[PDB]
Amino acid sequence: KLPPGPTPLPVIGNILQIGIKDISKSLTNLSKVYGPVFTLYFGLKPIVVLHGYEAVKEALIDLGEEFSGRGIFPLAERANRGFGIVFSNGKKWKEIRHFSLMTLRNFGMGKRSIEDRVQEEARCLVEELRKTKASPCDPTFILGCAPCNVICSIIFHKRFDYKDQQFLNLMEKLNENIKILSSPWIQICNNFSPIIDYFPGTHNKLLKNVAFMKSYILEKVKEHQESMDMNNPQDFIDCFLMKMEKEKHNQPSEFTIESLENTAVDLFGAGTETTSTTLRYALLLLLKHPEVTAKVQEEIERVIGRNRSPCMQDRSHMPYTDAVVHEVQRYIDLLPTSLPHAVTCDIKFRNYLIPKGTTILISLTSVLHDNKEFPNPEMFDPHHFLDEGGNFKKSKYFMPFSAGKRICVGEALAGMELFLFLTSILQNFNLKSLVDPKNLDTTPVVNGFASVPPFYQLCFIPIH
Ligand code: HEM
Ligand SMILES: CCCCc1nc(Cl)c(CO)n1Cc1ccc(-c2ccccc2-c2nn[nH]n2)cc1
């Protein structure tokens, strides 16, 4: 038998007993009744939900391979998304994940480190902030250009200028699809309809923008096919073509131009929004808690100084700053239910049997907001990541990137973008709120499977 759960109604399952507004709250509520493991029916489709650290750890880590599948919904087909990493499964996934992990190492693509690409961008990020001349500002756009430009660098061997139109178009389309995909209507409600697509227009728009991006990725690929030093692959494309020119006798292969571009779109998709929002939300949290902003800056002044830009080495000699970044990610809880998983085979899990294919909903919130581990888990406090001596305190419950075999491919790159961009900003700027901190409110605004910070403006005031 499958786990227990609230008895569904005929043909709509448990649809109307789940608050579509704040799903994570609804799942947590259900846990208080049915426990750490439970089933919901999303219209005859069962969904096992894991909730709390113990359940999540033993599914995702202890039974990693079994829980390594990606849950597929109709939106996967309508927006054609199962051909890269994020939404692929089986071999296709195993191979492309692995290649991408290797390639995304810090020195996986030649002499230029990932870290050097990020530092170059942190520089430019700082420079744009200057161009705002200390006037009010909605950092949404600027802060999103950086993580996007890092992906551009990783994929095409170098960055764009923030006013280059090719870049602006790329970003526009990315930003459009992300906002579209964030609608409850597309993420949830259209998924109730397994065959008929009630938003054909929207999917058409989504695909039209993917194609624009794909077509650009092809213009670059071709160019890389005539700048090809086989001994110095300078970016993700070179590395991919290399792997292609080495599987020529293993047709058919997972590595083709089709998969390269699908994978590149996955990187753009996964790489810019969440990093971008996390930065935006970090600023808002620093504005609200200026004692924190000040202590990070003490660390920056003492360890880094002004004669140079920050590097990843500094991180180990900057426990307060490390705690702050960690606390931002834990508090904001951006993907409260990760990405749905699926089991790969028939699996006994605790008391119950879960059939192969069954969708699995991991509650990251449950872990990140565990109160034994993080007392007062609803209130931003770097102290959650600090021992009584002021050293950094690791946590098994730090899973903003999820856990196990499907853990964020970008874990390290994100942490590098979070640590470098924030230290770089706080190194050269002080932050002023337009309105008084007292009435700012940084509570997450939550809409389906997405947390987001509330609109705010601020001034980037230069120091020294
Ligand atoms: C603050 C930043 C980020 C957060 C919080 C985050 C979080 C996540 C989460 C929760 C997942 C779902 C994992 C799962 O299915 O269990 C995921 C998947 C993924 N992330 Fe990120 N991520 C971030 C940044 C990035 C960046 C910069 C990249 C750049 C390469 C990236 C690439 C991916 C990829 C490729 C996947 C799909 C992994 C797979 O299914 O095999 N992420 N991320
Ligand atoms: C299939 C032929 C048209 C496709 C399409 N490509 C683009 Cl570009 C546009 C921009 O609005 N569009 C049209 C489009 C029209 C309606 C929506 C939409 C907006 C809000 C609420 C429902 C809809 C909708 N989606 N599908 N049908 N109606 C989205 C995109």
Ligand SMILES: CCCCc1nc(Cl)c(CO)n1Cc1ccc(-c2ccccc2-c2nn[nH]n2)cc1
């Ligand atoms: C111009 C192209 C814009 C990017 C975008 N539009 C479309 Cl449609 C795809 C579908 O794969 N993509 C790529 C896409 C890939 C993965 C995700 C995903 C990755 C990690 C965490 C959440 C996201 C998510 N899924 N749905 N919305 N955002 C987002 C976008």
Ligand SMILES: [K+]
């Ligand atoms: K239409």
